[PDB]
């Protein structure tokens, strides 16, 4: 009976709410109140990456925390050398519409994805010398909102088909489809150990999946708006998810509940990207206000008004070494901050 | 700098030069986006103008290249990828004039036209109103009245007046009328001049955008 199963689901929701509340003895603000605040953070524009004829949609770093891949609607996927501003590559896409770009940790591969419903994957280190597609994954009935390489062969694709997919690139099929997101998944974040990845979908709920086993482990529904970008804590037992409601809500895995919300009366433009630091003390976010307002993770206050971009900061990222912060925007420029 | 740095900087400037020539070609290569509902004459209009995911169609006409983009596939919320169509410099909406009574598909057609034209991203992209299946509407207008489609209708069951009323309602869905202008071309689904209409309308849009960029308009 649908009625009894629905009642059981409601009872399980009541049980999870009761358990979460019963485990909520004190908040993180209580613990962090008796410590010295971060204060004010001042980072300037150290260089601007010019050359994209169209607005940059996705940005990713590499393991060496030097190279930078940027995706634009001009049909070009351009890789940059951050320290010495230089366009490494200009990949002419088969479909000019790209929303996600992922630089593999090995640095040998890049990904795009968009309205073509296909994860175009390029072996940059082509024996020819140019850049050509190595595989065109065609199993997703929707746009590819976010992809993230696990290995050179495994890619997790957050798609518009309300499901994430783990792909075998050489095989071409989906080795595992992650179902459970009632809304199309916009962003996914990987744990450092690459064992459990979260997926922030449009259902105002990020889900913690087990890559190998194949099902979701915990669910977190605190947002009033869809999750556009999610980032694990450096430790990995928590994460911050950004929404279009201009509020970032930090969730702790072990308590599987909300921890803190980073919102203010001045900030109404929705968060387009979420970034932590190498220590997690600072919560960066890019909004539609063409600005990068950055928050203190421990204490709810805005510890920076970083702004150097004329248009919306669509893609925001922090290097693996934590030295710098990249802010890709729709003004066709990527700018680093220090 | 170093010889590698010098050579890489040169390759950067010359990749920039290649992108500059690509943008030169895209100065005459105009991006069109087709917006049609389920079976709204979109196939007929793409066929006439020729003479899932997305469908890309590249061509040219009197030294004016066109890249038409069909987005019928990828059914989603459309609020998370529509911003990819910021760079499109032409929009062609598609429908059928007789689609005012079956289930109402005119309601959904006007609905996504409103979501497109009155979009917080598409406040500066202009409209071409390609209509199809005009012969069925012409035959059927005298048969059944349009008052079921619009309760505020007092006109006669004539194809001219019904078409004019539907076009007034369709145009009223736009509120920012300064940056964009709606062209109209009533097609009886057999015309071969649709590509010529696209040429003239796109040239008009190029002229208007250039005037605005010159600060004159």
């Amino acid at each position: 009976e649908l009625d009894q199963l629905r009642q059981e689901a409601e009872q399980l929701k009541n049980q999870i709410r009761d358990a979460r509340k019963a485990c909520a003895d004190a908040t993180l603000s209580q613990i962090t109140n008796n410590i010295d605040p971060v204060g004010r953070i001042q980072m300037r524009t150290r260089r601007t990456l010019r050359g994209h004829l169209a607005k940059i949609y996705a940005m990713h770093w590499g393991t060496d925390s030097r190279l930078l891949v940027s995706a634009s609607q001009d049909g070009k996927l351009i890789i940059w050398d951050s320290y010495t501003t230089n366009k490494v590559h200009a990949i002419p896409l088969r479909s000019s519409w790209v929303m996600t770009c992922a630089y593999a940790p090995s640095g040998n591969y890049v990904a795009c994805g968009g309205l073509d419903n296909i994860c175009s994957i390029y072996n940059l280190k082509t024996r020819e010398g140019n850049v050509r597609v190595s595989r065109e994954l065609a199993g997703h009935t929707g746009y590819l909102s976010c992809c993230r390489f696990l290995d050179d062969n495994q890619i997790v694709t957050s798609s518009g088909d309300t499901t994430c997919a783990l792909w075998d690139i050489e095989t071409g099929q989906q080795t595992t489809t992650f179902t459970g997101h009632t809304g199309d998944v916009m962003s996914l974040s990987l744990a450092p150990d690459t064992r459990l990845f979260v997926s922030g979908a449009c259902d105002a709920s990020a889900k913690l999946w087990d890559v190998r086993e194949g099902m979701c482990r915990q669910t977190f529904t605190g947002h009033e708006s869809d999750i556009n970008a999610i980032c694990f804590f450096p430790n990995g037992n928590a994460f911050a998810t950004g929404s279009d409601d201009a509020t970032c809500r930090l969730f702790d895995l072990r308590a599987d509940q909300e921890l803190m919300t980073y919102s203010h009366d001045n900030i109404i433009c929705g968060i387009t990207s979420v970034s932590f630091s190498k220590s997690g003390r600072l919560l960066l976010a890019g909004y539609d206000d063409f600005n990068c307002n950055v928050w203190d993770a421990l204490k709810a206050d805005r510890a920076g008004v970083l702004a150097g971009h004329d248009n919306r900061v669509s893609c925001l990222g922090v290097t693996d070494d934590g030295m710098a912060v990249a802010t890709g925007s729709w003004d066709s420029f990527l700018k680093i901050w220090n | 700098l170093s010889a590698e740095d010098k050579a890489a900087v040169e390759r950067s400037k010359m990749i920039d030069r290649n992108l500059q020539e690509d943008a030169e070609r895209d100065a005459r290569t105009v991006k069109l986006l087709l917006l049609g509902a389920g079976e709204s004459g979109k196939s007929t209009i793409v066929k006439q103008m020729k003479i899932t995911g997305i469908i890309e169609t590249q061509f040219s006409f009197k030294d004016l290249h066109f890249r038409m983009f069909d987005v019928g596939g990828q059914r989603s919320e459309r609020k998370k990828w529509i911003h990819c169509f910021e760079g499109v410099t032409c929009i062609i909406f598609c429908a059928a004039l007789s689609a005012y009574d079956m289930v109402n598909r005119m309601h959904e057609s006007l609905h996504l036209f409103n979501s497109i034209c009155n979009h917080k991203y598409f406040s500066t992209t202009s409209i071409i109103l390609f209509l199809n299946k005009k012969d069925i509407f012409q035959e059927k207008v005298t048969k059944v009245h349009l008052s079921i489609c619009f309760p505020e209708y007092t006109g006669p069951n004539t194809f001219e007046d019904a078409g004019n009323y539907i076009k007034n309602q369709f145009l009223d869905l736009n509120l920012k009328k300064e940056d964009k202008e709606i062209y109209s071309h009533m097609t009886c689904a057999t015309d071969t001049q649709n590509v010529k209409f696209v040429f003239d309308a796109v040239t008009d849009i190029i002229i208007k955008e250039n005037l605005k960029d010159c600060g004159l308009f």
Partner: single-chain antibody
Amino acid sequence: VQLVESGGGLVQPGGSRKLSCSASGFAFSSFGMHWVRQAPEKGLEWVAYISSGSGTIYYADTVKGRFTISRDDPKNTLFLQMTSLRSEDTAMYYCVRSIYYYGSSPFDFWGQGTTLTVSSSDIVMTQATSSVPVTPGESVSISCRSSKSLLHSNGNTYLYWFLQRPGQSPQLLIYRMSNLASGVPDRFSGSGSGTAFTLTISRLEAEDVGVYYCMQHLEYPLTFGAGTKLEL
């Protein structure tokens, strides 16, 4: 990917022999190119450089203004229009597959070559190893000191390593003195202290036989070492 060429043959000194190198397999117009000579019984020295479409052309002191090298990007062919040949110009020219970005692998592919024969303040680098008997299954660290420190503000040490097998063309082994080129076995690695530059190779096989050239990329009048031959 191929780098076939033209030209060659007995050309009188003082004349004008044009070498055309056409490539089928990769993007000629978006990937730079070079010209490195090699005498029949001598080493290899860089002759001229052409950007991916002749942006800036650089010459050696012995070919400065004397040559005129260009290319046809639509024709996928690289043209070496060379004038006023001499006795020291007879050398086997490689239209080098050279690309230039960060972590790039320039000089990755060298073409089959076309030997051209004629009728009768640089960063000098040292390859004092000369001849070394390499035994299979043994780790080899081979050195090439630089006259000028190869470090830079960006910190990249511009030293290269190339493998010249008998009858074949050089292929890049180690680029930027530390990184490993694609298609090279992982038994090669690169490390250096700024001047003394050690190329670490472990458990060598017959595929490594040949000579090893250390190339810098600081000041564009590039230098190559004499080339230490590695034979069992």
